[PDB]
Amino acid sequence: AAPNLAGAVEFSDVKTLLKEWITTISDPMEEDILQVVRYCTDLIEEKDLEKLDLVIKYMKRLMQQSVESVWNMAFDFILDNVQVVLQQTYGSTLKVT
């Protein structure tokens, strides 16, 4: 039951929201991974995935600094969820160089 905090509608608020979840937290629960996915899956629903595509670059570059498998695997699933959901509405996915 999180507090009454905004949903980081702005990209500037999202980046800081992720960096903190990666720094402050080290061994999050499945819920944490499901929360980040919700925000993304919610964006594509409002065609506001524009900022989302950019967030992926921040997460992929962030999780990289970490060695823990929990983070590496987490990203693989998270990015896979946002890439799949959009693949159903669009038909394809984005490239992760």
Side-chain angles (χ1 to χ4, degrees):
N4 307 115
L5 220 296
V9 294
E10 292 279 31
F11 178 45
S12 289
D13 287 36
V14 179
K15 51 187 208 163
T16 311
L17 188 281
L18 269 166
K19 182 92 160 191
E20 283 300 280
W21 173 51
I22 301 162
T23 48
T24 71
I25 313 302
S26 70
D27 208 310
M29 275 287 155
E30 52 181 58
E31 56 211 41
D32 270 312
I33 300 96
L34 291 179
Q35 283 305 132
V36 292
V37 176
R38 272 287 161 72
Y39 170 67
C40 293
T41 306
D42 277 11
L43 286 162
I44 301 139
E45 298 264 271
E46 48 176 353
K47 315 229 81 177
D48 300 359
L49 39 52
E50 291 279 317
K51 294 155 228 205
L52 211 187
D53 162 277
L54 319 168
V55 178
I56 303 302
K57 305 220 82 264
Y58 208 53
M59 278 196 281
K60 68 181 289 203
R61 74 177 48 197
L62 270 178
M63 270 74 156
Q64 272 275 50
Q65 81 98 351
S66 272
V67 306
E68 310 311 324
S69 304
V70 55
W71 280 116
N72 284 282
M73 293 203 149
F75 171 54
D76 202 44
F77 174 93
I78 300 148
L79 82 90
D80 162 64
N81 271 229
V82 304
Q83 285 282 266
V84 163
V85 54
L86 92 89
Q87 167 177 227
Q88 308 211 91
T89 193
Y90 283 103
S92 298
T93 68
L94 307 163
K95 188 58 178 188
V96 52
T97 65

